[PDB]
């Protein structure tokens, strides 16, 4: 048994690009499992799942991702509603197994609705639309949640895709610093290192086709019928370039 | 079949109803305290004695704070006995307990109409005195000198008038928050504001005391005129908050 | 049961200034209970209480307020005397109940004698008279303990009262910083925030009448027969104004 | 008698044999991992499946890191199942365990000849990308972009050529060590170098893969010519490391 | 009746007797050690061997310190055995125990008349050497180079002469306190002085060894003349302490 | 029993310089017991002790003084050798009793060989000869371990002795800072305060006579036949003078 010979023979094995890249995708970072999230919503929720999901998205966007914590500072009626949601959907916090629901996961799996809701919810978010407008004129409300990444069509022409992601990153920079106060004294590049992984995971996920995602981007007014980013997106992308 | 992509796209096609969503926002919003429950508990525990006891507890809250066991350690024998009896009768707690528990601060907040009037008498015995406030803004409104005041604000006031009322009140909240907490020593105005704006806005926007009755109190307190326009003293304090550090 | 109506009716209740101010006084900060202190001294001490109290005042002023701690660095004779005092008077430390004695409480309750003793004890105090003299010429020794606050007549004309308290505060500023080393890097205003509460409590307490307190101030040479502060008091008040 | 001074002086008179002492130095030198044991364990646990599984584990090491339980917490259901099976079959551990335990990093290191080739494909999915490296030194050699590369270095190369190869590799190691560890934020080049030079030199000088076969890999990778002279890209990267901060 | 105000005012009318109060001050003053008890314990434990053992313990205190168990860990077999026997015989402890316990430092302090003389021989083996002291003040008095020296000071010396003696001694205490404690690194002269002045003054003012016998030692040590006037070397060291940092 | 009289009579006792200085030496700091180290080596090692000691010195100089720690990062063969050494010689770490061996103690007790080995081992030491050469030209390799102190003849003329010790201290300054990283931000004088005690202990120990130590210094080329330090020693001494 010549271990040195086994080693050199191993090195002589093909470097199969197709095979290796498939493994990369198989082992890639995944933030959440959209198909499982919806399956669980339908399972626990039955006939009530759609309305309950909408409530859970409003909760995620205006109060956060800790159901037991938010209950401590809430009206009697609101607390009762959340209590019932926890018991019905077995809601957890943070990053449990894929067989468990969280408020943030509901928002992410149903991003088409979430992003639209941001238009309505703007002034009740941790970073408001008004604040974003100070950084870039008419900042797109549809981009104002990490859930937006799942609406991005990665097959857009490179320059258009980059503009969409840079624009969205301007929000992510502000949002990350509000949610995690310890990121306030860190550079843009350092903060980006913390939000790019989940962003790219959703951009490149197998959930919602390229064509359907671009349809959402067009419906949201983020790109025109030719896929070119809106003036507001271009402004925000430029603002990200010079952001600190 | 179980087409989750299809279910997701049809979910996205459903109405994003502004009126419906805004109702949910209100249902799920931050609540600092439950005024109706506070008064219910006062009446329950206090019976015929609740009104007088509530006034005592407000004076206690405004001059000694929100820690009944702590304040008893530095008090006259007679005062200590009064507070001891109040704790046992009303089951008083410290800080922020459940909705089913009373605290001194919650009594003051639930009964803000009286609390804000009492501030006129109590000015020189508050943690931040009226005299101190006067150095920051001339003739500072005494009615604004407790977090309880937020529950007297009418959120339907014209944007500029509402902003002035809140900015003026925030001048006090800035000083008060720094005095009661030596821990919040070297932080900026905005960092201190982050500690008081959430409970402030919750009381401003709560369903307790109608918009009209709130404005009536503001008028009675001399903080706004018949049209809701803030007084000279309020405007002065709002400007002082803008330039405050 | 209309809770909103109950609330507005409550607001319509009179704001009785006399009633409210009486409550303020009833609930006011009290540092110690002078009447109880003397009662306990007489009870535990019997025929020996007066002499023992004098010893306890010397202990409080030259060693501090921790009887068990000071015993660890004391002559055999001194240790035995303190041991006996602890056992006889059940002496405690810090802020126990009003039914318990401490060395500092004895000094405070019997401030008339304590303040006179300071003349003799000056160079053995944590802040010496010599040190005080560097800050203000001929600093009044009678003011050199927190116990002095109980000798202040709050009915003195405002300017005279202010001068007395400012003069006393010059000492309190130095003393607080010696006893609590963490106050050394804090501003005068910040240090004042820590000594003004117990000071004012004693100034405004119901123990020893206005007339009798002013008699002490006159006997100590701190005010003249017309209540006007001495030159030394005025000097110290001015020194406090410009102190850091 | 028991003359310890005499025994000590006669000990000092004994040979200080350079060849003997240098052999002891080698015997007792730092070892980061045991390549022969790694391959033995792979063959033992894997059987007919070991080669394909090893390739998977190398891709896993290079794109997700050295913590199999941690990476599983953010992975597809299918990916998680593959990794779970790999852990159970090969008894995978994290960090630096005993010689009798496999880790993902050890698989990559023991099979560096293949690992370094895979880096050409994997460039844009590594913690520090090839594109990032190109900004620091133009056309940075992809084959050098893993600590595994140290095991491909022939220590018998002429002094200047060896130094260039190692300096060029160290440019990557500087960036890589800072990226994977936010803990090593505000430290200098030399302080970061202190964390990677020991395992680097151990692999460079190890008895695994002959000097001649190592140089053959370097030649095949286009890093040196037929005489062992480093490529233009290697020289550029060596210079970049000199002036790096 | 129980008129506590009356009792308090009549208490204030009682004599504030300077002589009586000053006696109490002395009774209750800080005591660092009890010299009479130290010598009693030495005689008790040591019997016929106490004098020689005391000298050994003083040499031990001055050259190794006040931790007998610690010093044994870095000592010859013979030295260790001597110290071990001394610990068992005299029940030696570290730091500051009760009056009924001996320490090495207490032996040196209780027998300061001999300790200060031994410093002349021991100069170059102390934590701060005489040579080091000479760089700060020329011909620094060796007799002053231990805290034990404080017990040789006559507090009845004229104010200026006493101050000079203590200032000169304090120059050593400043250096000594900083050397034996790496913990007291970045503190000022006054902050270091706060750590040594209390035990210094206690020994200066203690009832052990008469004022006259203390001055006799000072004269014998060449530190003062027949009139109590400090030597040139003492004056030089006093001036050095004034300008020291 | 007059304790004051006993005290003054004690002071009247002779200050015997011979007696006192003998006690100083008896109680002096000792880093290790060379005679005991060799006795233990011979006892545990029997016929193998000399070869094993050489291995242990190479271990001490190239890996350090923690046998169980170094084993964790070592070849299978090397680990087995060290394991056997630990079991045979009952090797410990740090500062155990004199009846226990450590790797550093073997190197120190057999310094004559250790110092020669440094010539061979230079580039594998924590501070290399190459590094030392940057500070002082042709730095003497024989000085590059704390073990060297036991080769120093304290009877050398003062200037020659000082030059030897200053030269050796240049290495000790660099070495101490590498082994103890917390000494990096400390002054030369502060670092010296940590290495001078063990240095002087070995310089002045009763192990290996003055004549034999000087013979080693001459054989190592550190002094000439007249005891005068080499040019390299003088260079290093000067480098220590101006070192930070
Ligand atoms: O991790 N986003 O599918
Ligand atoms: O928390 N104010 O309703
Ligand atoms: O608290 N002084 O009565
Ligand atoms: O640790 N590389 O053999
Ligand atoms: O503490 N000296 O008596
Ligand atoms: O401590 N050296 O013998
Ligand atoms: Na998404
Ligand atoms: Na309302
Ligand atoms: Na008093
Ligand atoms: Na090899
Ligand atoms: Na005396
Ligand atoms: Na040695």
3-state secondary structure of E137: coil
* Interface chains of chain E (3 or more CB pairs under 8 Å): C, F
- Residue E202 Cβ inside 6 Å of ligand 5? The answer reads yes
- Which tokens belong to D82? 């593959």
Q: How far apart are the CA of A101 and the nearest CA of chain D, in angstroms?
A: 15
Phi then psi dihedrals of residue D199, to 5 deg? -65, -30
Q: How far apart are CA F111 and CA F129, in angstroms?
A: 18
Which pair of tokens denotes residue E98? Answer: 């009760």
**b/e map of B99-130 (b: 16 or more CB within 10 Å)?**
bebbbbbbbbbbbbbbbbbbbbbbbebbebeb
Q: What is the dihedral of CA A10, A11, A14, A16, to 10 degrees?
A: 100
What is the CA angle C182-C183-C185, rounded to 5?
A: 90
State which residue of chain D sits closest to F111, comparing Cα positions: D12
Taking phi over 0 as left and psi of -120 to 50 as alpha, with beta for the rest, E109 belongs to alpha
Experimental technique, in short, is X-ray
Q: Where along chain A do its domains lie?
A: 1-244
Q: Which residue among C39, C53, C63 places its CB closest to the CB of E4?
A: C39
* C207 contacts: CB under 8 Å, gap ≥ 6: C34, C35, C109, C150, E4, E5, E8
DSSP C29: B
CB–CB of E192/E184 below 8 Å?
yes
Alpha carbon distance F30, B147 (integer Å): 70
Task: Report helix, strand or coil for E126.
Answer: coil
- Cβ neighbours, 10 Å, residue C158: 7
Q: How far is the CA of D6 from the centre of ligand 6 (A)?
A: 17
Interchain pair F34, D99: CB under 8 A: no
CA atoms of D124 and D171, how far apart (whole Å): 17
Q: In the beta sheet, which residues pair with residue B230?
A: B224
C205 CB-side CA count, 13 A: 29
Kindly list the residues from chain D whose CB atom is less than 8 angstroms away from the CB atom of residue F112.
Answer: 8-9, 11-12
Task: Compute the distance from residue F202 Cα to the ligand 12 centre, in Å.
Answer: 5
- Inform me whether the C-beta atom of residue E34 falls under 8 Å from chain C C-beta atoms: yes
Distance (Å) from the alpha carbon of A123 to chain B's nearest alpha carbon: 11
Distance CA F176, CA D173 (A): 28
CA distance C148 to C165: 10
Q: Whose CA is nearest to atom 3 of ligand 2?
A: B203
Say how many C-beta atoms besides its own lie within 10 A of residue C211's C-beta: 9
User: Of the bound ligands, which one is closest to the alpha carbon of residue E147?
Assistant: 5
- Nearest ligand, CA D209: 10
CA B217 remoteness from chain centre = 15
Length of chain C: 244
Contact B100, B37 (CB under 8 A): yes
Cβ-Cβ contacts under 8 Å, A19 against chain D: 55
In this complex, the residue of D54, D59, D110 whose CB is nearest that of residue A27 is D59
How many angstroms separate the first and last alpha carbons of chain E? 62
Exposure string of F191-212, with b = 16+ CB inside 10 Å and e = fewer, is bbeebeebbbbbbebebbeeeb
**Inter-CA distances, C24 with A221, B92, E131, Å:** 63, 19, 69
Q: For residue B192, count CB atoms less than 10 angstroms from its CB and return exposed for 0-12, middle for 13-18, buried for 19 or more.
A: buried
Q: Which residue of E has its CA nearest to C54?
A: E21
Q: Which two tokens stand for residue E25?
A: 């001050």
DSSP label of D182 = T
CB F196 within 8 A of CB F204: no
Half-sphere exposure of D215 (CA within 13 A, CB side): 16
Q: How far apart are CA F244 and CA F242, in angstroms?
A: 7
List A223's β-bridge partners, or say none.
Answer: A229
Q: What is the resolution of this structure in A?
A: 1.6
Number of the ligand closest to the Cα of F108: 12
Q: Which of A231, A239, A234, A244 is nearest to A132 (CA)?
A: A239
Separation CA B90–CA B88 (nearest Å)? 6
At B245, list the tokens: 């550090």
Interface test with A, best of B3, B5, B6, B21 (most A CBs within 10 A): B21
The encoded tokens of residue B11 equal 């979910």
Q: Is residue D206 within 6 Å of ligand 4 at its C-beta? A: yes
Are F119 and F125 in contact, with CB atoms under 8 Å apart?
A: no
| Ligand 9 centroid distance, CA of E194 (Å) | 30
| Residue B188 DSSP class | -
The answer to whether the Cα torsion of F222, F223, F229, F231 is positive or negative is: negative
For residues B114 and F121, give the distance between their C-alpha atoms in angstroms, rounded to a whole number: 87
**Per this entry, what is the length of chain F?**
244
Residue C26: which of B76, B113, B213 has the nearest Cβ?
B76
**Structural gaps in chain C: residues followed by a C–N separation over 2.5 Å:** none
The beta-carbon neighbor of B39 closest among C6, C15, C28 is: C6
Chain F residues with CB under 8 Å of D191 CB are: none
* Best CA proximity match to E30, nearest among D211, C44, C79: C79
Contact B168, B175 (CB under 8 A): no
Rounded to whole angstroms, how far apart are CA atoms C35 and E2?
9
Phi/psi at F49 (5° precision)? -60, -40
Query: How far is F232 from F223, CA to CA, in rounded Å?
Result: 10
CA dihedral over F204, F206, F212, F217, signed as positive or negative = negative
CB contact under 8 A, C28 and B75: yes
Which residues of chain A neighbour D124 with C-beta distances below 8 Å? none
Q: Which atom of ligand 5 is nearest to the CA of E109?
A: 2
* Beta pairing partners, C223: C229
A184 membership: H or E segment, kind and range: none
Write the residue in A6, A24, A33 that is nearest to D125 by C-beta: A24
| Cβ distance of B76 and C23 shorter than 8 Å | no
What is the rounded distance in angstroms from the CA atom of residue A164 to the CA atom of residue A155?
12
Q: Which of B172, B164, B151 is nearest to B231 (CA)?
A: B164
Distances (CA, A) of D118 to A18, D57, D63, D143, D150: 12, 12, 11, 8, 15
Distance CA B35, CA E91 (A): 70
Coil, strand or helix at D235: helix
E35 part of contact set with chain C, CB < 8 Å: no
**Among D17, D7, D29, which Cα is nearest to F54's?**
D17
- Cβ neighbours for D4, distance < 8 A, ≥ 6 positions apart: F34, F35, F38, F39, F207
The Cα–Cα gap between C191 and C185 comes to 10
Helical axes F111-121 vs D18-28, angle rounded to 10°? 80
Closest among C148, C236, C126, C155 to C199, alpha carbons compared: C148
Distance CA B178, CA B187 (A): 9
Say yes or no for a CB contact (<8 Å) between D59 and A23.
yes
D170-199: burial string, b at 16+ Cβ within 10 Å, e else? bbbbbbbbbeeeeeeeeeeeeebbeebbeb
For residue C63, count other CB atoms closer than 10 A to its CB: 22
Contact assignment for E7 to C42 by CB distance below 8 Å: yes
Alpha helix locations (H) across chain F?
3-11, 17-26, 34-45, 49-62, 67-70, 76-89, 103-109, 111-121, 129-135, 158-179, 188-203, 210-219, 231-241
How far apart are alpha carbons B85 and B103 in whole angstroms?
Answer: 14
Can you count the helices (H) and strands (E) in chain E?
A: 13, 0
F228 in a known ligand binding site: no
Rg (CA), chain E: 21
Alpha helices of chain D — where are they, by DSSP H?
Answer: 4-13, 18-28, 35-46, 50-63, 68-71, 77-90, 104-110, 112-122, 130-136, 159-180, 189-204, 211-220, 232-243
d(CA B7, CA D126): 35
- Residue D75 pairs with which residues in a beta bridge? A29
Long-range contacts of C72-78 (CB under 8 A, 24+ apart): C72/E96, C73/E30, C73/E31, C73/E32, C74/E28, C74/E29, C74/E30, C74/E31, C75/E27, C75/E29, C75/E31, C75/E34, C76/E34, C76/E37, C76/E99, C77/E27, C78/E27, C78/E28, C78/E29, C78/E31
Angle formed by the axes of helices F34-45 and D4-13, nearest 10°: 70
């Amino acid at each position: 048994d010549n271990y040195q010979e086994l080693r050199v023979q191993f090195a002589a094995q093909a470097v199969d690009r197709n095979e290796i890249e498939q493994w990369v995708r198989e082992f890639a970072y995944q933030g959440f499992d959209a198909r499982r999230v919806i399956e669980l919503l339908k399972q626990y929720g039955g006939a009530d799942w759609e309305k309950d999901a909408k409530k859970m998205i409003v909760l995620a966007l205006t109060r956060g991702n800790k159901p037991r914590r938010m209950m401590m500072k809430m009206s009697k009626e609101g607390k009762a509603t959340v209590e019932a949601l926890i018991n019905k959907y077995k809601l957890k916090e943070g990053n449990p197994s894929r067989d468990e629901l969280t408020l943030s996961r509901v928002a992410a799996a149903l991003a088409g609705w979430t992003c639209q809701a941001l238009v309505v919810l703007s002034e009740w978010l941790p970073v408001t639309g008004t604040t974003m407008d100070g950084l870039s004129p008419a900042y797109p409300r549809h981009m104002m949640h990490p859930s937006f990444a799942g609406m991005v069509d990665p097959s857009l022409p490179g320059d258009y895709l980059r503009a969409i992601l840079d624009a969205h990153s301007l929000y992510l920079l502000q949002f990350s610093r509000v949610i995690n106060p310890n990121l306030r004294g860190r550079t843009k590049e350092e903060v980006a290192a913390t939000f790019t992984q989940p962003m790219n995971a959703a951009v490149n996920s197998n959930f919602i086709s390229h064509e359907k995602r671009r349809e959402f981007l067009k419906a949201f007014g983020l790109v025109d019928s030719n896929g070119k980013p809106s003036a507001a997106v271009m402004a925000a992308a430029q603002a990200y370039k010079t952001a600190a």
